Design a protein around this ligand. Structure first.
Ligand SMILES: NC(=O)c1ccc[n+]([C@@H]2O[C@H](COP(=O)([O-])OP(=O)(O)OC[C@H]3O[C@@H](n4cnc5c(N)ncnc54)[C@H](O)[C@@H]3O)[C@@H](O)[C@H]2O)c1
Ligand SMILES: NC(=O)c1ccc[n+]([C@@H]2O[C@H](COP(=O)([O-])OP(=O)(O)OC[C@H]3O[C@@H](n4cnc5c(N)ncnc54)[C@H](O)[C@@H]3O)[C@@H](O)[C@H]2O)c1
Ligand SMILES: NC(=O)c1ccc[n+]([C@@H]2O[C@H](COP(=O)([O-])OP(=O)(O)OC[C@H]3O[C@@H](n4cnc5c(N)ncnc54)[C@H](O)[C@@H]3O)[C@@H](O)[C@H]2O)c1
Ligand SMILES: NC(=O)c1ccc[n+]([C@@H]2O[C@H](COP(=O)([O-])OP(=O)(O)OC[C@H]3O[C@@H](n4cnc5c(N)ncnc54)[C@H](O)[C@@H]3O)[C@@H](O)[C@H]2O)c1
Ligand code: NA
Ligand code: NA
Ligand code: NA
Lengths: 468, 468, 470, 463
C-alpha cells in the first residue's frame, strides 16, 4: 500500500534492481562508505530532500544514504535525465520519488515542491542538490514570504514563469510562514555542480544564503574526475545514441574549455572528430591551443562544423544567427547544466519534427535543417545514460561525506551560513577508496622521503592551492 | 493489401523512414550512385535476394538497388542485428523483408529460404550476401539434391541441425530440382564480409562454386574503411549501450589484429581502456606491438582483463576454461561474424539471468559471474546500431557496383564461376564519391608530375599490389 | 668589447651562433617580447641589480636581455652543471653581461660561480635574486645562519654536492668582510623562484620564520605550472632520450615515477612517442588520475624487471635504488627529469665500471656484467641531453618571472610584500596567457556584459575563482 | 696498412663501435640472421657494392653481410645522411667505405664510382641500393657505351650534370667495354626504397633492366614498418634537432598520405601539432580524413601552416610561389627520398644565412624568411639520426635475405620476397619487445584454411 511516488511504470523495478546490482560492483567508494558508516548510523534522524538526476547511479547513492540511517524524498533535477527503471526501483524500495523521463516543466516544479511535504508531517532537514533548484525554491519562497513579492512577476523564460507561479501557489496554499519553517529546519545543503555552486556563492556574497553549504563540485575528486572524465565518456555516448553519425571525418565545435569542455573536446577527438574550441578565458584558450585544438569564435565555427556542443555554464552561446548559418543537418547539443546555452526559445516559431525521444529536426524558412538533441538540455543524460557508475562513485562518495559533515559533524558550528569545501584528507580518502577496483598499486613514502618533501606519510600530500 | 513480410511491428515504419532520410544525407556514395545510374536502370530485370543485417544503412542500399530497377527480397544475416524500424520501413515500401531483432535461429533459417520463393513465383537471379548463409543454402541444397545427402545427418551444432533440417524440408516441400533451378538462374553473388569471402574461395578452389562471385570485402574502400573505422566507432558503442561501464581505467583484451581487431583495439583504447591483443600471425602481432599494445595469450589475459572481445573470424577463441578464470563481472563479447569465437554452448548448463535484450549475466558454481553481450553474436549490431552510415556508404556503393557488374556487365563472360574483386578504378571512384561531404579538397597532379611518377592525372594512382 | 673579461664561458667564439638562435627564439617568445615593448619606455628595473641562477639556455638569454631592456644590471649563472647551452652563454658574455656558465662544469666550479653573483661589479651586492631551484637563495640563507653563529650543519655533509656547498660557505665566511651575508640579506629586495623544488625550499623557510626577504612563487602561476611543467616536459623529455640513445620508442615499456605536473607531461611524452607507459605514485588522487588516463600504476619494484626506460619525475629522493637497477633488464635506460640528481642513487654506482658513450651518456656495468644506460649522470635529462623546453613555453614562464621582478623591485613601495611567499595576481596570470594567443592563431571570444554578470565575473577578468584548478 | 676509404674523422671509430654495439642489442633480426646464416656462409664469393645511408644501423647491416661471407664496398646514398662515427667504425673494420656527412654532389658521384673498382681488381657481382643511384650509374654507362651518348649532353639539373660528367669521365678513363663488364657480372640488385623501386619498374617496363632485382620496399615488414613507424619516430626528431621549436600550438602541413606521409602526419600530431595533409589519390585522401586530418591543397596551406613536410616521392610539391606566400620563419623540409620535392634551385637567387649544419634561413625580397632543413634533403637523416635501430632491423633483415636470394638461390624481372620470409622477419623481432604469439590448434588452422606454421594470409592481404 505504498503510494507516495510518481514514476513512469513501477513494473520496471526488477530491471532497475538488476542494473543497480551491476552498478554497485562499479561503485566501490559508495559501497565502502556503506560498510564503514553503516554501523555508526551517522544519518539517523536526517530527512534528506534530494534533487539530482534520477539515474541508476543516483539510486546507489540514495540507498547508501538510507543504509546510513537517512529518511529520504527524491526528485530529478532535469526533465529528461531520469532513468525510469532506476526511479521505479527506488519507489519499490518504499522511498518517495517523483521522477519521470520526459516530464513537463510544470510537473518538474510541482515535484520539487513535493520534497518539502515530508511524509508523516514536517519538512526536510537536509538538502542534496544538483544545480540548485531545490535550494532556489526555498530561498525564493522565503524572499517572497518576508514580503518581497514583485520579482515574482518579472518577465522570464517559460520555465521561470512556471517557477514563479509555483512560489505564488505555495504562498497561497501553505500555512503562513512555511518557507521560514523550512529554512529554519534545513541544517545544510550539499551541491554537486558548477552552476549550482555559482548560485550558492552569489547568495553568500549577497548575504541571503539561509543555511551552511558544502560545494561538492570543487572536491578534486569531483571536478577533475566527473566533470572531465565523465563527459569524456558520456558526451559522445549521447551523440551516438541520438544520431548514430560517423564521427571520423566530422568537425566538431566545443564552446568552453573548463572541466566539462576539456572532457567534451576529448570525447569528440578520441571518437575521431577534428575539434575546434571557443573560450573567453585566455588561460583556458591557451590550454586548448596547446592540446592541439583550433580556438575560434562561434561565428567562425557556425558554417564550418558538423557538430556543436555548448559546455560553458553561461547563456546565449549558440544563437539563432549561428544556427541560420550552419550546414544542413548539423547537430547541436548542450552538456552544460541548463538549456539557455542554446537559444532554443528563438527556434520555437520554426517547424519541429520529432525523430524519436530527445531528437528533433528543426527546419528554417530556407529549408536547411538542424538536428537538436534533448531540446538543448543535458545531452549525456537526455540522449544516453549520463556518466558511467565508476566516476559517479567518486562524486557521490563526496556527496555522502558532505551530508555526514553537515548533518553529523557540525556540533561545534564549524559550518556557518557560508560555502565550504571538504578537507583534502577526505578528498584523498575518496580517491583511495577507488584504487583497488581498477588495479592501482599505490607506493608508500618511506619516512625519510616524506620528511624530504615536507609531508606526512599518510598525507595530505599537496598544498591547499595545488591544482592537480 | 501487401502482406509479404515478417517484421516485429509495422507501425515502426514512420520512425524508420525518418532515420532513413537522415542516413541518406550521410551516404553520399549511395545517393550519387542513384543519380548516375537511375536513368540507365542497369538493374531492370534483376531479382536480388539479399541476406545482410537489416539496418537503416541496409535500407538505403535496398532503396538504391530499387531505384536502379531491381526487384528485391531481403532478410537479415544475423538474428540480433535487425533494426526493427528499418525493417518496418522496407516492408511499408512494399518490399518483401523477413527480419526481426531477436528472431529465433529456426525463424532465421526459414526466412533465408523465403528469399528463394520469389513473389509471383520463380526464383531470384542475383544474391547479395553478408556471411555466406544464403549462398550456403543454395550450395548445400544443390549438393544434397544431386544425391550426396549423408552430410545432412552429421550436424556439428544446434545451428547446423536447424540448417540441415531446413535442407531436408526444402527437398520435400519444394519441386524436384529446385536447387538446380535456383543455381541456373543466379547470375552472380556479391559477398560483403571476410568470413563469407573465405567460404567463397573454399568453394571456388574445390570447383563447387555454382555462379560467378565478387568479393566486396577486399575492395580497398571496404576492408580498410568498414572493417577498420566501422569497428573503431561501433565496438565501444555496443559495449556502452549494453553495460554502461566506465572504460577509462579498464583493461581490455582483443583477440585478433586484422582489420576488425585493429579497429576494435582502437575503439577501446580511444575510449580509455588499456588494451592487450592476441595474434597468431607474427606480422599482425608486430603491428600491434608497434602501435603500443601488449601482445599476450588468452590464458595470460583471462584472469585479469575487464573486457574481452573476439575479432578473429576463427573458432574456440574464448573457452569455458577462460571464462571460469575470469574476474567477477568481466564483460565478454564477439565482433567477428559468427558466434563460435566464444564457447557459448559450453555455458548452457550454467545459470543465465537476462538483464535486458542482448545482455545476460552467467553465474558459475563458485558464484563468479560474467556479463555476456548478444549471446556471443556481433556485438556492434546486437547491442547498438552497427557501423554508422557514412562508412557503410562506402561498403554499399561497392555492393551496388558489384551487383551492376554481375547482372549487367557479364555479357562477354568476363566473370566465370570464380571469385573476383572490383578493379582499382572503381575502388578509387567509390572513395572520390565520399570526399565532398567531409570537406576534403583533392589535389590534381600537374601534367609534369603525372608523367614524372608515370600515372594518368585521373588515375589509377597505385599499383595493383599497393597495400594502402 | 676588449675591456670586458668579467665572464666564464666555454668558448666566446660561439657568440655569433648563439645570437642567430636567440633571434629565432625571439619570434617564438611573444610574451617576453611584448613585455619589452610595454615596459621598456618606463624602465621599471632601472636600479635593479639582479643575480640570476637559471639554466643558461637560449631561452634564458631572451629573459636576460628582456631584464636588461627594462633597465636591470645583471650577473648570471646556470642552476645545473649540464644545462648550459654554450652558444647562449657566449652571446650573453659578448653582450657585456657577466655570466659564469659552462656545459659540463664541475660541482666545485658550479658553486664558486654561484658565489660570484654576489660580488657585484663596481662593489656592493645584488638587490634582487631570480632563482630556479633555490641554490642562490640557499647560499644567502645558509651563510646568514652560520654567520649568526649556527655552524653545526656545516660540519655534517651527506652528499658530495653538500660537502662542496658547505666548504664554499666556510670559505666565504673566511674571506669576506664580517657580516657579509647579513649585508646581502639586507640589500635583496626580493627573490622570484621558478620551480617546484625551489618553491618547496621557500615555504620551508617562510614557515620556520627564517626567510630573509620577500619571495614570489612563480612556479604556481597557472601559466607556469600548467604549461612549462606539463607541456614543456611533454615536448622535451623524449627529445632528451632520443638524442641520448636513438632508441625506438614504439614497442618499448616506460616507467615514470610521479604523476604531478612533470610526471603527467613525462608520461604523455613517452606515450605519444609510442611507449606503453607505467606510472608510480604516492598520492592517491594523482594515482587515480594516472589510472583514468589509461596508465598502469605500479610500484618501482614491480616495474624494475619490466620496463625498458625509467624516468624519475618526483622532486623526491631515493626513487631508483641500487636494488632496482640490479633488477633491470640489460641496457635498460635510466634518467631523471626532476630538478635534482638524488632521485636516482647515482652515488651508489660510483664503484661500478662506467664507460662513457658520448657527453651525458654512460654505460654502467655491474660485477655480474649486467648493464644500464644512464643519461646526464642522473641530472635533468631534457636540459642535459637535449635543449630543454622549447622557447614558446619558456616565454610563458619567463614573462611571469619578469612580472615578478617588477612586482618585488618596483611595486613594493608600500611594503605589500613582507618576508613571506606570494603568487602573482590572477589578472597578471591571465595577461601572460593573453600575450601568447596571437602567435599561435587563437581567437578569443569576448564576453558580453550580460554573460559576464551571469557567471559573476568582469568582462576583463579575472574569469575564475582563486581556488580554480584549470 | 688499410686506407681504401674516405671518412670525415677516422678518430670517431671507437665512438662508432660503442653505438654499433648498442644498436646490435636493438636489432634482433639482423643478429638472429648472423647467427643462423653465419655458419652457412651463403654470401661467400659475393662482392656487394652497397649504396645506402651510412648510419649506425647500416653498419650493423654491413657487418652482418660480412659475417655471412661477403666482400663489400660501401657509399652513402645521400650527401647529408652519413653518421661519421658509423663510417669511421666501418673503415676501421677494414671495409672500404666512402661516406662523409656533408660531402658535395661531386664527391657523392665520385664515391659511387669507387664501388665498382673492386679492391684487388675486377668489379662487384651484387648491388644493394637505396634510391637506385648505383643501379642508375651502371645502366647509364651501359647505354652510352652501346653508342647512345647524346643524352649525356642534355642534363636537367645540377645533380644530373654532375652525374653525366661522371659517366663521361668513366667512359674516357676505363677500359673499353667496362660498363658491359660490370653489367655482365652483377647477379642482381636489392632495392630499399619506394623511389628506387619506381626506377626499377620503369627500367623493367622499358625493357632496359640489366639484371634481376628484388623490391625490398614492398615486403610487408619493410613498407608497413620502416616507412610508417620509422618516419613516425624520426620526422619530428629531425625537426626538433634542427629548430628546437614548440610543436604544441603549431599547424603542420604534410604533402602525401602514402606510407611515409601517414607516418609523418602521425609524427607531428603525436608531438602536438594540428596536422593538415594534401593528396592526389582519393583513397589515401579519404584515409587521411577518416584519421581526422584536414585535407587541403598546398595553396590553402601555404599562408597558414608553421611547418611543411613533403612526403610524396614526386617533384615540385613546394614551389617558390608557395614559399613566397608562407608566414615569416615557417619551417620547410622534405622526408621523401630526393630534394626536388621542394624547389630548392629557385631559392638559390635569394639571401641564405646559415644557422648551423643543415639549417638555413632564406630571406625573400619583402623580408619574410623561411627556415629550410638539410637544403631540402631527407630531414630525418640530415637533421637527426634517421629511423631508430629496431625498425631498421626489419628493413635490413629483408635486405640480407634478399641478397642471399639473389646471390645464392619467377618470370617478372623485379620481384618481392615470399610471404613466408616476410613472416619470418616479423617473428625474429617479437621476443625482444615482449610479444607472445598464440599458436593455432590444428582444427583452428583448418577452420581458417592455413597451416599452423603459416603463411597466415593471402598474397593480396593488405595488413
Ligand atoms: N552534463 C554533465 O554531466 C556535467 C558534468 C559536470 C558539470 N556540468 C555543467 O557544465 C557546465 C560547465 O561546467 P565546468 O565545470 O566546465 O565549468 P568551468 O567554469 O570549469 O568552465 C566553463 C568555461 O566556459 C568558459 N566560457 C564562459 N563563457 C563562454 C563563452 N561565451 N564562450 C566560450 N567559453 C565560455 C569559461 O571561461 C570557462 O572556462 C556547468 O553548467 C556545469 O554545471 C555538466
Ligand atoms: N561486426 C562487424 O561489423 C564486422 C565488420 C567487418 C568484418 N567482420 C568480421 O570480423 C571477422 C574478422 O575479420 P577481419 O577482416 O579482421 O579478418 P582478418 O583476416 O583481417 O583478421 C583476423 C585476424 O585474426 C587472427 N587470428 C586468427 N586466429 C586467431 C587466434 N586463434 N587467436 C588470435 N588471433 C587469431 C588472424 O591472424 C588475423 O590477423 C570476420 O569474421 C569478419 O567477417 C565483422
Ligand atoms: N626538467 C624540467 O624542465 C622541469 C620542469 C618543471 C619542474 N621540474 C622539477 O620536476 C620535479 C617535479 O615537479 P612537479 O611540478 O611535477 O611537482 P609535483 O609536486 O606536481 O609532482 C611530484 C609528484 O611526485 C609524487 N611523488 C613524490 N614521491 C614519490 C615517490 N617516492 N614515488 C612516486 N611518486 C612520488 C608526488 O605525489 C607528486 O604528485 C621538481 O623537482 C621540479 O622542480 C623539472
Ligand atoms: N626519409 C625516409 O627515411 C624514408 C622512409 C621510406 C621511404 N622514403 C621515401 O618517401 C617517399 C614517399 O614514399 P612512400 O612509401 O610513402 O610512397 P607512397 O607511394 O606510398 O606515397 C606517396 C603518396 O604521395 C602522393 N602524392 C603524389 N604526388 C602528390 C602531390 N602532388 N600532392 C600530394 N600528394 C601526392 C601519392 O598519391 C601517394 O599516396 C619516397 O621518395 C620514398 O622513397 C623516405
Ligand atoms: Na550511467
Ligand atoms: Na630549448
Ligand atoms: Na638511428
Amino acid at each position: 500500500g505504498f503510494t507516495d511516488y510518481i514514476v513512469k511504470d513501477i513494473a520496471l523495478a526488477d530491471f532497475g534492481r538488476k542494473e543497480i546490482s551491476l552498478a554497485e560492483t562499479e561503485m566501490p567508494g559508495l559501497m565502502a562508505t556503506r560498510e564503514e558508516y553503516g554501523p555508526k548510523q551517522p544519518l539517523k534522524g536526517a530527512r534528506i530532500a534530494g534533487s539530482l538526476h534520477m539515474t541508476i547511479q543516483t539510486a546507489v547513492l540514495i540507498e547508501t544514504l538510507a543504509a546510513l540511517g537517512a529518511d529520504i524524498r527524491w526528485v530529478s533535477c532535469n526533465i529528461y535525465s531520469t532513468q525510469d527503471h532506476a526511479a521505479a526501483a527506488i519507489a519499490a524500495a518504499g522511498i518517495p520519488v517523483f521522477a519521470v523521463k520526459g516530464e513537463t516543466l510544470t510537473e518538474y516544479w510541482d515535484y520539487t515542491a513535493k520534497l518539502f511535504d515530508w511524509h508523516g508531517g514536517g519538512t526536510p532537514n537536509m538538502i542534496l542538490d544538483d544545480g540548485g533548484d531545490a535550494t532556489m525554491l526555498v530561498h525564493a519562497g522565503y524572499r517572497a514570504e518576508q514580503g518581497d513579492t514583485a520579482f515574482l512577476d518579472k518577465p522570464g523564460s517559460e520555465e521561470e514563469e512556471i517557477f514563479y507561479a509555483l512560489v505564488k501557489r505555495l504562498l497561497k496554499e501553505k500555512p503562513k510562514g512555511w518557507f521560514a519553517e523550512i529554512a529554519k529546519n534545513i541544517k545544510g545543503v550539499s551541491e554537486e555542480t558548477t552552476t549550482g555552486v555559482h548560485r550558492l556563492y552569489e547568495m553568500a556574497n549577497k548575504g541571503t544564503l539561509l543555511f551552511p553549504a558544502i560545494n561538492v563540485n570543487d572536491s578534486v575528486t569531483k571536478s577533475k574526475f566527473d566533470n572531465l572524465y565523465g563527459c569524456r565518456e558520456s558526451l559522445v555516448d549521447g551523440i551516438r545514441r541520438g544520431t548514430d553519425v560517423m564521427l571520423s571525418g566530422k568537425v566538431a565545435m566545443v564552446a568552453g574549455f573548463g572541466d566539462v569542455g576539456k572532457g567534451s573536446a576529448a570525447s569528440l577527438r578520441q571518437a575521431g572528430c577534428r575539434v575546434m574550441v571557443s573560450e573567453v578565458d585566455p588561460i583556458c584558450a591557451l590550454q586548448a591551443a596547446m592540446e592541439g585544438y583550433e580556438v575560434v569564435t562561434m561565428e567562425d565555427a557556425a558554417p564550418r562544423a558538423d557538430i556543436f556542443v555548448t559546455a560553458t555554464g553561461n547563456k546565449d552561446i549558440i544563437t539563432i544567427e549561428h544556427m541560420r548559418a550552419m550546414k544542413d543537418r548539423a547537430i547541436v547539443c548542450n552538456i552544460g547544466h541548463f538549456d539557455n546555452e542554446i537559444q532554443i526559445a528563438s527556434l520555437r516559431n520554426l517547424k519541429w519534427t520529432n525523430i524519436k525521444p530527445q531528437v528533433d529536426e528543426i527546419e528554417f524558412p530556407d529549408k536547411h535543417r538542424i538536428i537538436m538533441l534533448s531540446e538543448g538540455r543535458l545531452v549525456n543524460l537526455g540522449n544516453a545514460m549520463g556518466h558511467p557508475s565508476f566516476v559517479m562513485s567518486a562524486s557521490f562518495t563526496n556527496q555522502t561525506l558532505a551530508q555526514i559533515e553537515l548533518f553529523a559533524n557540525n556540533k561545534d558550528s564549524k559550518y556557518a551560513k557560508k560555502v565550504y569545501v571538504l578537507p583534502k584528507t577526505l578528498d584523498e580518502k575518496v580517491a583511495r577508496l577507488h584504487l583497488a577496483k581498477i588495479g592501482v598499486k599505490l607506493t608508500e613514502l618511506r619516512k625519510d622521503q616524506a620528511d624530504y618533501i615536507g609531508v606526512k606519510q599518510e598525507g595530505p600530500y599537496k598544498s591547499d592551492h595545488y591544482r592537480y
